[PDB]
Design a protein around this ligand. Sequence first.
Ligand SMILES: CCCCCCCCO[C@@H]1O[C@H](CO)[C@@H](O)[C@H](O)[C@H]1O
Length: 339
Amino acid sequence: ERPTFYRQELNKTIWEVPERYQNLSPVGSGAYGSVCAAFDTKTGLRVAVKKLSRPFQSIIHAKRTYRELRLLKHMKHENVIGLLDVFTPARSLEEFNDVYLVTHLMGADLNNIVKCQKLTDDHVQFLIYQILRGLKYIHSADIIHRDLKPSNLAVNEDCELKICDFGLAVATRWYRAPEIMLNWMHYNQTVDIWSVGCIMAELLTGRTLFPGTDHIDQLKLILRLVGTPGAELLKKISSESARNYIQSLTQMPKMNFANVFIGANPLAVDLLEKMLVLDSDKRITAAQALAHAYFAQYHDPDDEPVADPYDQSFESRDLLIDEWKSLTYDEVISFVPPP
Ligand SMILES: CCCCCCCCO[C@@H]1O[C@H](CO)[C@@H](O)[C@H](O)[C@H]1O
């Protein structure tokens, strides 16, 4: 039943992994934990193996460990990072102290693609299509990503793409929706559509759309493009101080995006106009965007699947270290690899 493990001292720690994984080599350390590239001798795939850092050091670490494992076990979609394997060298709950995750090693991210390469329109369509397809799936599980940016988009050779998080793929601020920088505290899923808009603009032009030096500059750059809030939007702002400030602003009109994205496909410009709207209620959804004529060559309504509902009820629970550890052990033990 149980595999044979082998011991190895790497970044600065012991790696104990099943002997099916060969030729470990470090590719990234820090707040994620710690990650090695490896060859999965069973499947002939290159994989990434992540050893979680200090997984059960405190209540908060332990709950984070649980959260990450639960999320990754749920995602079963071609355009979202998934779990190939999860294991521990421990034989029982009493000795359970280390957790390793195994995912595909896609060989790069969209940062590396963006300015080593000037993208054709067909290839922009393909990249954004795959983002939106993965996002439809994530949103259907009632999950919001909140941090979509090029370094969270893994890409291989053929520019097949997966949405990532937890380090498994310069400034994050550049892709954030305005309402996050205003500390809104209720978010629509379409915060993620704003970020897609920013990413798409950049694939088209080869430049960051809103390269703010800080959150205030970032907002200034955004308003110059989309204009200052209209009355219809102002009706939905409950914060007195935010209304006051916005009202102090000298009004500016929406720019016509055709004048900004010069020479882009007219359909891409249209789609951009529908993503980069200040009012989150009026942004196109991932589902609706898939059907936009810009993606006519890739869209198939019968092959854009949705997710099973994801039980987030644990986020509201306050438990002990050993309880979060036990729940995590349960999830390791119940793991079933994909085909
Ligand atoms: C500088 C002005 C920035 C205004 C940002 C406007 C965000 C508008 O989007 C708002 O998002 C909220 C939360 O997702 C929703 O509850 C509101 O109904 C919606 O209007």
